[PDB]
Write a protein that binds this ligand. Structure first.
Ligand SMILES: O=C(Cc1nnn[nH]1)Nc1ccccc1
Ligand SMILES: [Zn+2]
Length: 258
């Protein structure tokens, strides 16, 4: 009886195994655009993905992760609200059964069709496992997806999903350039939060881009053909793998833009 996104094991149940689910800095949250304050002291974000080395794509039963070589400072996030250097370890998405839901963060209660998370860890803690134990251990860059025009840089991802249909399957996924997943603008909102899956650790500086990327209906349809289940088990389509908005509590969302 492991955690997931079904009626019997979904987000409303997670607190039983992970009591931090009811903590003071849980993610995601609704971004109230009229309450978020422009902070003129934030910096431009520095996304340095020229030297990124993707390795593999894995269906973990919750989502699919595109994994990077994080054994040196190749693909790093710096600047914005961050102090020091955060190394890209993986990206993944959360998405819906239909285009009216799927994102984890919301914007004035609007849900996007999906949300991309590029997960990075603070190199001052030496490894990812040590970083998740610290309040400034991770930086997650979140990007909303809307359905419209195709995203050319997403198609290599879409076209490998047939090969990782079920839980525990992986495929070689070298030479993928994550720069092709970014919008034009790096304007962002930031706040202190958590991982949005168990273990829900309160170790993330969230950086959520204002500008969504457009993907095609055909692209997201292929996401929705993945399976939560393992090979040969009853089919459970991998859809609605998002945690809803959590209480903001004693937190301020800051905007990089006026
Ligand atoms: O990547 C996620 C999902 C997520 N968290 N925050 N946004 N997405 N979780 C996770 C990563 C490493 C180890 C344990 C859990
Ligand atoms: Zn995520």
């Amino acid at each position: 009886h492991h955690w997931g996104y079904g009626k019997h094991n979904g987000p409303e149940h997670w607190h039983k195994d992970f009591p931090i689910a009811k903590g003071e800095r849980q993610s995601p949250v609704d971004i109230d655009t009229h309450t978020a304050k422009y902070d003129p002291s934030l910096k431009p974000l520095s996304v340095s993905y020229d030297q990124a080395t993707s390795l593999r794509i894995l269906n973990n039963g919750h989502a699919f992760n595109v994994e990077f070589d994080d054994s040196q400072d190749k693909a790093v996030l710096k600047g914005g609200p961050l102090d020091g250097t955060y190394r890209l370890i993986q990206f993944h998405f959360h998405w819906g059964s239909l285009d009216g839901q799927g994102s984890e963060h919301t914007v004035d209660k609007k849900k996007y069709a999906a949300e991309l998370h590029l997960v990075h860890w603070n190199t001052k803690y030496g490894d990812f496992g040590k970083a998740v134990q610290q309040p400034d251990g991770l930086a997650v860059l979140g990007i909303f997806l809307k359905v419209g025009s195709a995203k050319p840089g997403l198609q290599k991802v879409v076209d490998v999903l047939d090969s990782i249909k079920t839980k525990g399957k992986s495929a070689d996924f070298t030479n993928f350039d994550p720069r092709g997943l970014l919008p034009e603008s790096l304007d962002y909102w930031t706040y202190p939060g958590s991982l949005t899956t168990p273990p829900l650790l309160e170790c993330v500086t969230w950086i959520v881009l204002k500008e969504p990327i457009s993907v095609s209906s055909e692209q997201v349809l292929k996401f929705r053909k993945l399976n939560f289940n393992g090979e040969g088990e009853p089919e459970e389509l991998m859809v609605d793998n998002w945690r809803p908005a959590q209480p903001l509590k004693n937190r301020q969302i800051k905007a990089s833009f006026k």
